[PDB]
Structures are given as structure tokens and as C-alpha cells.
Design a protein around this ligand. Sequence first.
Ligand SMILES: [Zn+2]
Length: 261
Amino acid sequence: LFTSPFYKPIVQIPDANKKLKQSAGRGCTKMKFKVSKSNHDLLKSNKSYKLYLFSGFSIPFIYETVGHEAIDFPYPCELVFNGTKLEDNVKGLKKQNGTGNPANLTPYLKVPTEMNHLDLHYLNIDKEYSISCFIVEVFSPEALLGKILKRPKIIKQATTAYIKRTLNEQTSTVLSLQCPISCTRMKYPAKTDQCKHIQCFDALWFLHSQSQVPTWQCPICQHPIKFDQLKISEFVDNIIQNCNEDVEQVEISVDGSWKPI
Ligand SMILES: [Zn+2]
């Protein structure tokens, strides 16, 4: 589904749809389609435009839209576009559904006058799938970080109020300045207002992780979050800007004050 911030649709490619039906065993599904010269000119008009293949669960017996499906490729799958195998990690996190990525067909496209062949080899198919192709504008983690930075941060007053309201449980708590993902000093300590914890994670490393495994779960509380909920924490940010690189942890009291450990 186009709920991802890394790619957004510009136009659907016609005659590039396909339904994959259940198969007991071995099989291969073929798709022929052409990409008009106008769509080639559009791809050339902007460096951020790519041709992405999408696969989703095809829920039967009801109406479904072209994009609303969460990205789910049949696992295992071998995708071959114009003879060249696609090395894309199309379906990451095999254990979870909806954590797949699209396949980039842009570099292996043929001229408009010729035909594009997409083969999909499989050993079995337990559920029906919908296959689509879209031209999309892609965004890198750095641009998305820029978007996050331009947002209003989580004010330090809110964090101090939360600390004071929490530590009255029945002495001190440890705030890490390190990122759980990168294991390095955070540069962009971020989280969500939905998160019930003062600990943060580096926004850039989070976006880097999600760009290859779209779980969209907080690396700390594992709650499902969304891109537009990410905001910088002014409290941890100020603590970092006023600390030496040596410090990895910090002691926090009910006062909101903080001491290097
Ligand atoms: Zn959280």
C-alpha cells in the first residue's frame, strides 16, 4: 500500500496488472506489457521517478482498489524482468505480513516500441495475489529526516511533566543517549507523542531501517507508529547538545535535572 513515505504514486501503468491464483505446486506466471513513450519521457523528466512493481494479498469476494493492498509478495518468488533476475528484497521479514518492499524495474526497461516480459516463478501459492505497476516519486531517508526536523518538536516542559508524573510510582532513572538501532550517540533523538517513554531513537537510523524492513514499530516499545507521528524530543536533544561525546547514559531525578553517569 502507498501508506509508505518513501514512494508516492504518479500514474498507474495500464495493462500491467495481474491476478495470481492459488497453485498446489510448481508454477510460473508471465506478464507482457509496454511502457508508452510518454511514460518514458515522464520517467526522464524527474530523477526521482521510478517504475515500481507492487504485490498484495487479493482478498476475494469483495471489491478491492488498485493500491490499498499492503505490500505482500508470494514467498518464495523469483522475479525475472526482461531476462534479468531482480535482486530486490521484495518481501522482507518473512514472518510478518505487509512488510514487503516494491521491486524497481526502471534500469531493466526496454525502449517503448518493444515488449516488456515479467516472469514470476514459484513453488506454490497459498493465497491469491494482485500484481500492479506504478510510476512513483521516491524519497530518501535524508529528505524525510529534513521533513521531520521542520516539524514542531516535543517541548521539554512536556517531558519534565511526564517525568514528575511517572517517578511518583509508589529514586533515579537512566536515560540513554545511544540509539538502539545504530548503537551510537544519537544525532536526531525522536519518538512519538503516543510513546510512553522518555527514551528516543535516531530518526535517520530509524528511517534507514524502515526503508528495508517496513515494520513501523517503535524500536523501544514496539507500538505501531506512522511517519507523520515522528518528532524530535527537545529534552534529549538539549541534553545531547550539552554533553561530551564520552557520555552514553545519564541519571534523571524527579526534579527533571540530569547528571552524567
Ligand atoms: Zn515508543
